Design a binder for these strands. Structure first.
Ligand SMILES: [Ca+2]
Ligand SMILES: [Ca+2]
Ligand SMILES: [Zn+2]
Ligand SMILES: [Zn+2]
Lengths: 548, 344, 547, 345
DNA sequence: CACAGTGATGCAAA
DNA sequence: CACAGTGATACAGCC
DNA sequence: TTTGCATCACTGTG
DNA sequence: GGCTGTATCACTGTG
């Protein structure tokens, strides 16, 4: 005999579809003669407890503009958007949970973990003290999502996903707050719970705003409120702190009202021009926020001081749009690594062509330089050339062996020394904005970070001025300037990266292909439900039943 | 009525349904682009230039006293007489309505370069709620000018708005608003002859009358064939407003109105049912007191225009309509519409 | 407690990987206390029997240039190709089974099926008479196969697959042949047993020949021989008939010595030219053969009659290369449908713009016509635009509802009847070359096929003259000329189609990323072994244990 | 020695390792393309035109008496003095060796338009087995001309070839073959000095001697540094062949040989070990009886040439070597090789 | 006339 | 310092 | 009450 | 002695 919950856990964790599981169950029953696996209807009955809209809960004070019903599941992401022929065209299929139901479902899944942490922290396991749940929000935009035939809108070939992850829960027990749950693998796809799936372009601001306005409305509603929920007997109270740091640079620019990527104003944390960043390179402070962006947009619209276009753009630094999502200013570790890799790749191409003494080169010779670099990299580091830049290429490129292999193509030796020093400094600085707990994992590296940043900036301005003189890269600026301050503010950079959402995109593609109905009006619902079930600690605990 | 195909340059992506076109001394300008203004054209107002059946959109700069308006997607626009434009309502790219009146004028004009002045005027009194799809016209009586504003769509009030139906819309009340631009005041009037709200209608401004024809009511999901005449009298005392329902209206939603000659107008396009598209044109002639509408010759629409599900357009102010049609080829392509020009 | 064979069947046919199966097994054992499933090493031991290289067999007379050993499994596809720096560069990874060993394994996996078939026709189960089997061969060239990192040759981003399927087996009893096995789903991916997997370009003749020469040598050895095997405890004797039919037009042209792509000579079955086909359209006979192509190449190389280039090309009828794979002249039932759909799509585009009345048009106008057709097809037939035509689009396009939907874009009413007549004739002709047994599935359609072909050709020459005067397409020529004769020769067109190999390409793509080691030195052999297991009737029989 | 890049037109893909170049009265022609001949150029021979450091390949037509030869991939080619070319052996695109002798000559050239004549010469007697990578030269003595063919690399015999090792190769016997082209006869001679087979070697043709230097023996997987002189005498009776081993040889496999002046040759390219590539150049000075091998200046190789794993090339007949290195990048790209012209004064 | 899914729903059978 | 596979092989531990 | 199977508009490899 | 569990190897994919 085997329980329906365990059968469901096996099915959802070993990438099994309902049809394949039906085949397995039928064959096992026919041969053994005894019903070992539970049938499909039993599994789908057992899956209702895990999904949202099952457990009662209360909000005090009640959420503004949010329904008080506690039995809402998968709802339309358009949120009543008008589809009449007279109004603006709508070509988008969106499905979402409710933000106040997804949270209670996640907490009820983590009930056992919360109780275990309470017991292991020497606290009594009946306290109803107000917990503080920190939740990290990620929004990602996938391309090359093929559309389907059939009735429905002319939906584009792109998708947008909005997800959240519970990071930390703390309880106040006197003069100090003590932890009862900390996520061990924050960047894993196992803990990244989907909240909204839509098929629309990331650059389509009207559609993106129309779909994501209800979610932001709910989130702002439950910032000042307390949630009462019965968790294993006693009812307990929860608060929430939302930290949206899983966004990429382009999406932060779009949703915080800042201008497009190519502009004089480069950093999304401070307000410094590219030339000023190239001249300073080290000393900057974080002076940007959602409220400041709103005020600056108001200044831009009103033009109270009667300034020309250029003077107004200087006054309101890059805020030519009105923000609509509050994001914490931080650095995405994955994209920072990729950008640094691309910059170093271009540095190698320039160095194997001796641009430091030949300022001008033909367009047909830089291609030859790139071809030589690609051939030698394949020969030595076993890396094939790729079109864009991904993380694995960055990890295999930012090693010292790559520099040693590349130096065979550089005629000079002082260039060898300069490039080796640059790579050593970069590798010394990297584990600070990539580890999950720098104070307990790389303390010497964290302490010796300002010195290494200054040395890196000096080397960049002295021995690489042919590319960095009046122009610096956004990621280089962020890495050299804001990393110690962000570490001091938060605790870790890298535990708040977009890695979880990027990993979940793979699950999204796999589920849309072989775990969801192929109709145009059910695929998003099926994918959302299956993804939520996959990211469930109650089910994942059974797969670790061998060791206990 | 002749139909020609217009090719558009490198900023096609800036044209979206619900844009507005303005006419200043024979020069055509464009407002209401898709997305927030970029670095190339911070103002968002372009110079709509058509020559040898080719369309170009070049940027236009505002003045130092100006206010940089958001791209409004379904505003109410009227001409006020130097010649200035009044835009009220609309929908910003963040999908939130606006309740601000903006007045556009021409500050300095150079050789093929025009600088605008956009002044924001704040209303006081019984101010209309934020809305889109409504209509505003200007009436002259006894040497004094005022503005008449009718109803449209709006979101539910903040006390009855739920996230699960966040984007739902309802027709505003059928109240008639008189707006004094000189002092920036507004007064609301309830007329018993108007009982159902209207949106996406057509308004024609005579000397002291406003004719409201066409429309769509969300309460009953019908397109009534009703014509209303609103007369405003402005004596030394309080203003007086009267409404009279006249026979002879037509059922059309989101029509395009143009002025061919004096005391003559042409209504082209719109919608009759959800899946039925109005392919006939109407001619409206106004007299001292009585007006009459009739059916004129149907222009030779092409094959693509007839079978398009949706179509949008605007008026170019010289008896010409600029109207688009979706191409349904947005996948890895730059051309998403098949704009046409129609001459009356 | 299940048996290792049953557990292996469940794992293979439920698309489970070894890691996922280990997770399932561990959880079930831990939570039930009893070993319901079986461990990975047990499954791996059980999978030896179902792979080539286990069963003993003999050949009489012994195969020429083929080793006599009976314990060969996955072997290198390069076949000792010189990888020295002085020789020609080698930049491919290939793995293959020996053809004889693979066929022995395939026959042994259907032992129960053969015995049941011979019991079902009142034959003794112990008969050892010569079983004549017929095998269908397919070769397909995939694209957009991403290359992996790591040490190894700079392999290209394309793959080539070779596969065979056992179609039928007959035994001579008295004076007639009785069938003991006939595959019920010939085009399915469940019977498309792989034989050779290589990462090479289809249009790379040097590499393709260097890797596929040993297989053709083994096949030529097997043609004149007789296999002795053991089934049910009795020795049985087998003979083989190979038929290569899964090839597409491009591959058969490249491999049969014919000139590539478009030319004066369009058909791979007869010697007609494009102009002659456009003038006759109905009357041709099959003449091409492998031996004929060899003789034509010899004439081309030797130039016996001292002719110029043009006269020599006319004499040799487009054979400018030496063939190296024997393929029967036949028409694929999938690419033919796709090509006909593309031709009808272009016809619709032209008819929208009234090219019969206006001989000339501009590129912008043609693009506008295509845009109108695409929009209306999405509105009515719920078809999105696609870059290249595929089978589902062809099937939905070739319905009369599509012609009715396009009818309201054509202004002239006289064109409506012509287009409807064309589509009706096409739909009356299609099942003849699409069915798996036309005699017993569409007898009337088979009987009146010449009449429909003549009417179709008359319509093409009269109404749609503006596109088919002096130029006709290869698939139209084949469907209007050769199908009444190919069916009389073989028995069906649809059964011998590339559908099985095309469906197996999907399995290849799935396995390369979910059931194979992610290294360039192991992925091909892993995929080959897993595919062979997935196409095993012994394992597939367990899943149908409820019924 | 000057090295200069050369760009190729739209038929770049036709160039593959093992091609051959022929010189006819100052014109350069190309043979041995990749894949079977297409409809644009049925013959397979092209006009290797290099002007202002740009390469174009225009099609060339054979004559009515010609034989349309297959594209051979590693043939043994020699000049014969009108001026004609002799091609033996090679590999067809189907990867099968050839045992045919083709004689190519020029039938008619009006103005930058040459028509060829290819005649297949039947070989009788002790006909050499099909092979590739061998060498053939022409010797003149007492007013009579013959050809000397040395061993190369072939497949296994038909009685010992297994499908599992179908493409395996073995060095042929070190026999020396004398070929008479007037009557199309062949005679095999066994020389005790030649004990191991050689493939991809260099042959210099003096008056009545053939110098064989360099090579690669597959039996031992070594590249011996041996020099052999084959002296052939043609009296009224049976021909006589002698072989002598001389000191001073070099170890090189698949070298490119060119002639600068009268009795002066230059050897460029080749391999010393598998992962080591011969980046030096040698100068061969011929004499009445003795020859001298010297080391000349190393050409200014570019970065991409030095680090390329493989390279190939041919002789353009006017003290110019046309060589090429792979470009690795071949996905969604048309340029797969980079080509250089090397001039020796 | 490709074929084995893709899952939720509803009705028949036990 | 992303993380959960991808499978065959070899060695240690348990019945 | 609990199982089992057919149905719906679609997929992907071409 | 046979069966079973687990670590190791160079890689994947979502960016
Ligand atoms: Ca992304
Ligand atoms: Ca194919
Ligand atoms: Zn900054
Ligand atoms: Zn034919």
């Amino acid at each position: 005999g085997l329980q329906p919950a365990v059968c469901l856990a096996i099915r959802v964790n070993t990438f099994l579809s309902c049809s394949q599981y039906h085949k397995m169950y039928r064959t096992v029953k026919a041969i053994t003669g005894r019903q070992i696996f539970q049938p499909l209807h039993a599994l789908r009955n057992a899956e209702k407890v895990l999904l949202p809209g099952y457990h009662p809960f209360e909000w005090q004070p009640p959420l503004k503009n949010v329904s008080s019903r506690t039995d809402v599941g998968i709802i339309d992401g358009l949120s009543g958007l008008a589809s009449s022929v007279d109004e603006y065209p709508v070509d988008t299929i969106a499905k979402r949970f409710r933000y106040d139901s997804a949270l209670v479902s996640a907490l009820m899944d983590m009930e056992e973990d919360i109780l275990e942490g309470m017991r292991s922290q020497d606290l009594d396991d009946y306290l109803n003290g107000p917990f503080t749940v920190v939740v990290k929000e990620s929004c990602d935009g996938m391309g090359d999502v093929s559309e389907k035939h059939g009735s429905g809108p002319a939906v584009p070939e792109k998708a947008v996903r909005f997800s959240f992850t519970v990071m930390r829960i703390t309880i106040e027990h006197g003069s100090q707050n003590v932890k009862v749950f900390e996520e061990p693998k924050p960047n894993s796809e196992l803990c990244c719970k989907p909240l909204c799936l839509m098929l629309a372009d990331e650059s389509d601001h009207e559609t993106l705003t129309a779909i994501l306005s209800p979610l932001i409305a709910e989130r702002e509603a439950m910032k000042s409120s307390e949630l009462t929920l019965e968790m294993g007997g006693i009812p307990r109270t929860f608060k929430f702190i939302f930290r949206g740091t899983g966004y990429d640079e382009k999406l932060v620019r779009e949703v915080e009202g800042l201008e497009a990527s190519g502009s004089v104003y480069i950093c999304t944390l401070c307000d410094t021009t590219r030339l000023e960043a190239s001249q300073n390179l080290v000393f900057h402070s974080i002076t940007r926020s959602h409220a400041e962006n709103l005020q600056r947009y108001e200044v831009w619209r009103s033009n109270p001081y009667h300034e020309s276009v250029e003077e107004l753009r200087d006054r309101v630094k890059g805020v030519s749009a009105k923000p609509f999502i509050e994001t914490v200013p931080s650095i995405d570790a994955l994209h920072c690594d990729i950008g640094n890799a691309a910059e170093f790749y271009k540095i190698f191409q320039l160095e194997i062509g001796e641009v430091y003494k030949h300022p001008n080169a033909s367009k047909e010779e830089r291609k030859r330089w790139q071809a030589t670099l690609d051939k030698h990299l394949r020969k030595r580091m076993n890396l094939k050339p790729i079109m864009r830049m991904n993380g694995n290429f960055a990890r295999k490129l930012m090693t010292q062996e790559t520099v040693d292999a590349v130096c065979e193509l550089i005629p000079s030796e002082e260039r060898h020394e300069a490039l080796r020093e640059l790579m050593d400094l970069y590798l010394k600085m990297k584990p600070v904005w990539r580890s999950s707990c720098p104070a307990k994992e790389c303390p010497e590296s964290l302490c010796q970070y300002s010195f290494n940043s200054q040395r890196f900036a000096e080397l960049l301005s002295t021995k690489f001025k042919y590319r960095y003189e009046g122009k610096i890269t956004n990621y280089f600026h962020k890495t050299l300037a804001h990393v110690p301050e962000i570490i001091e503010r938060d605790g870790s950079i890298g535990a708040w990266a977009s890695e979880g959402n990027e990993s979940g995109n793979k699950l999204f593609r796999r589920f849309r292909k072989m775990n969801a109905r192929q109709s145009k009006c059910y695929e998003m619902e099926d994918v959302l439900k299956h993804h939520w079930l996959y990211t469930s600690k109650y089910l994942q605990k059974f797969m670790n039943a061998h060791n206990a | 009525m002749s139909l020609q195909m217009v090719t558009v340059g490198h900023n096609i992506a800036l044209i979206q349904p619900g844009f507005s076109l303005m006419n200043f001394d024979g020069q055509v300008f464009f407002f209401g682009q898709k997305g927030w203004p970029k670095r190339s054209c911070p103002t968002g107002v372009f110079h709509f230039d058509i020559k040898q059946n080719h369309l170009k959109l070049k940027p236009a700069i505002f003045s130092k006293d100006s206010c940089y308006l958001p791209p409004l997607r379904y505003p109410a626009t009227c001409s006020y007489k130097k010649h200035q434009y009044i835009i009220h309502g609309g929908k910003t790219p963040n999908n939130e309505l606006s309740d601000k009146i903006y007045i556009m004028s021409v500050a300095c004009k150079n050789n093929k370069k025009v600088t605008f002045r956009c002044t924001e005027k704040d209303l006081v009194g019984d101010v209309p709620e934020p809305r889109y799809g409504h209509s505003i016209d200007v009436v002259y009586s006894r040497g004094k000018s005022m503005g008449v504003l009718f109803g449209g769509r709006s979101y539910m009030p903040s006390t009855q708005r739920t996230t699960e139906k966040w984007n739902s819309v309802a027709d505003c009340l059928p109240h008639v608003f008189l707006i004094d631009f000189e002092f920036g005041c507004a007064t609301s009037y309830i007329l018993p002859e108007l009982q159902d709200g209207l949106s996406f209608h057509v308004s024609i401004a005579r000397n002291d009358t406003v004719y409201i024809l066409g429309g769509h009511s969300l309460a009953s999901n019908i397109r009534p064939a009703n014509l209303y005449r609103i007369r405003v009298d402005l004596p030394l005392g309080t203003p007086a407003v009267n409404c009279t329902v006249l026979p002879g209206g037509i059922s059309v939603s989101s029509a395009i109105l143009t002025q061919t000659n004096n005391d003559e107008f042409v209504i082209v396009g719109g919608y009759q049912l959800e899946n039925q598209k109005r392919m006939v044109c109407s001619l409206v002639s106004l007299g001292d007191n009585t007006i009459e509408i009739s059916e004129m010759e149907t222009p030779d629409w092409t094959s693509d225009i007839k079978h398009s599900k949706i179509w949008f357009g605007s008026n170019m102010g010289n008896g010409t309509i600029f109207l688009g049609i979706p191409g349904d080829n947005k996948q890895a392509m730059s051309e998403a519409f098949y704009f046409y020009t129609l001459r009356c």
